[PDB]
Design a protein around this ligand. Structure first.
Ligand code: SV7
Ligand code: SV7
Ligand code: CA
Length: 522
């Protein structure tokens, strides 16, 4: 008996959004996986979507795997800054597929748009994928020409099924529902006598925030108290459930938007409606996850499926109107082409994001959010449900990263990572470490006080060894200097220890430099 795998990835979901992670959002199917499984509180991704994906599916750092910076932000020709998963890496599905696994995917790819970079070309026997980093959840497209804001030009509903670039979408297309139908179709059509690797990367709860009315309607008024009232509920509940320490000091909320109590009644009603919509996206995703899990359960296969759920990065605090490289004139265009009046928020012809204060409610007590290298952007909820593993039913604070997944699943599938050559081309070997020892109860963790780990994206840096972490946030968002935090004592990265622990910081700076050098950071 070799296990199946089901790897589920939410897009921009916050740490505490889910019930079992302290949330008020209805997430029954995940909750059952979570409570019975092992919930991780110190599992890390990268600070953004394609870099994290490239890590998930290779076992090594994104600067090596081809996604040194996002394809949207370019460096060109430099090795590892291709904008797609490149040929210096072998992908997890490619390895499993050669060792007998049915490799199935329905979801967001974000690892390349060209025929030779598709899920189909990178190891997926069957795939229904959105290739870009985002799109209108309903397939409603604005006009595409030179004047179209760059962020919208970058996010058409460009879907593929295997080799076929789809020329249209079914009527009633809603992303999370379509990903559910398709993964379910592929499972129903599988060879029932061989195991599967099912990849279910949703695009929910990623902007634009959109969900079926009948689900949003369930959260009517739930968010009228605003994002700071929400953060306080989330923090109380995280403490209550044992996910963060009872005495944790939460990092302060930093936002340049007007605070909730400064907003006029209409502004509040609309931002509350966006968080209602967001909630509805999470529940609806959860509901599609339940369709898949329930089918597997009825087939007598769930207990022999290793189930991993994770978000791909921290909650999305961005103001898309603030980076002019997303424009020109994003708001003016949206004003001319979309209907963001209150009643319409959440339909196909709205386009909203919920902004820095709602995001920060879900990353608390961590500092900031997506696209930053602080714990807010990189510490994400994750759970592992596999009953043959001995650590199950508990909360774990042991360090782990997204790069650990590939070695774990290869391990469990009984497949050796090929080493430094594959198909004759020279390739990278995983920087992650298999969780098998730790999850089978042999060891306390998969990493230790000497484990060194690096991040670097959008000019921001982090370097971590054991539980010490240094951070570099450039201007205008940080001091453009190295700050040092003891994450065991200060998980909010509030208390800069550069002055009191300068030796330790210089050690980390040295490790940072090895990292820059070993991964090809520019
Ligand atoms: O927020 P994401 O990094 O996943 C993204 C997607 C499409 C365009 C730009 C950024
Ligand atoms: O900040 P958002 O673009 O999502 C917005 C919401 C209501 C009216 C205008 C813009
Ligand atoms: Ca993401």
């Amino acid at each position: 008996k070799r296990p199946n795998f089901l790897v589920i990835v939410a897009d921009d979901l916050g740490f505490s959004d889910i019930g079992t992670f302290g949330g008020e959002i209805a997430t029954p199917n995940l909750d059952a996986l979570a409570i019975a499984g092992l919930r991780l509180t110190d599992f890390h991704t990268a600070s953004a979507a394609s870099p994290t994906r490239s890590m998930l599916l290779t076992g090594t750092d994104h600067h090596i795997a081809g996604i040194g910076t996002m394809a949207e932000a370019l460096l060109e020709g430099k090795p590892g800054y291709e904008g797609h998963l490149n040929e210096r890496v072998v992908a997890l599905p490619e390895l499993l597929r050669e060792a007998g696994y049915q490799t199935l995917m329905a979801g967001k790819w974000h690892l390349g748009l060209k025929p030779e970079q598709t899920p189909h070309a990178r190891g997926f026997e069957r795939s229904f994928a959105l290739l870009p980093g985002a799109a209108n959840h309903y397939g409603f497209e604005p006009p595409y020409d030179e004047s179209t804001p760059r962020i919208l030009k970058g996010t058409p509903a460009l879907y593929v099924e295997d080799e076929r670039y789809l020329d249209t979408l079914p009527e009633g297309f809603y992303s999370s529902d379509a990903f559910g139908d398709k993964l379910l179709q592929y499972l129903k059509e599988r060879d029932q006598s061989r195991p599967f690797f099912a990849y279910l990367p949703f695009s929910a709860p990623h902007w634009p925030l959109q969900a079926p009315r009948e689900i949003v309607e369930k959260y009517r008024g739930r968010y009228d108290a605003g994002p700071e009232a929400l953060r306080q509920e989330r923090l109380a509940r995280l403490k209550e459930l044992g996910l963060v320490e009872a005495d944790v000091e939460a990092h302060p909320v930093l936002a340049l938007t007007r605070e909730w109590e400064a907003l006029e009644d209409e502004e509040r009603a609309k931002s509350a409606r966006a968080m209602e919509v967001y909630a509805a996206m999470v529940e609806r995703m959860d509901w599609n996850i339940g369709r898949v899990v329930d089918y597997l359960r009825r087939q007598g296969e769930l207990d022999n499926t290793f189930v991993l759920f994770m978000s791909d990065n921290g909650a999305e605090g961005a103001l898309l109107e603030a980076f002019p490289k997303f424009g020109p004139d994003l708001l003016d265009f949206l004003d001319r082409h979309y209907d963001n009046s209150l009643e319409n928020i959440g339909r196909a012809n709205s386009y909203v994001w919920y902004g820095p204060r709602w995001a920060q409610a879900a990353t608390a007590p961590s500092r900031l959010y997506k696209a930053f290298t602080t714990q807010g952007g990189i510490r994400v909820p994750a759970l592992v449900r596999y009953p043959r593993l001995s650590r199950q039913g508990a909360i774990s604070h042991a360090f782990a990263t997204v790069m650990d997944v590939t070695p774990t699943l290869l391990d469990l599938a009984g497949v050796r990572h090929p080493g430094k050559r594959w198909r004759g081309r020279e390739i990278a070997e995983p920087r992650g470490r298999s969780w098998l020892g730790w999850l089978s109860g042999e060891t306390e963790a998969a990493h230790d006080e000497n484990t060194v780990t690096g991040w670097g994206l959008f000019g921001m840096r982090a370097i971590r060894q054991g539980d010490w972490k240094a951070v570099y946030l450039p201007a205008p968002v940080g001091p453009a200097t190295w700050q040092l935090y003891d994450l065991a004592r200060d998980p909010g990265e509030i208390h800069d220890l550069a002055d009191s622990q300068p030796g330790k910081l210089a050690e980390l700076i040295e490790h940072w430099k090895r990292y820059v050098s070993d991964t090809g950071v520019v």
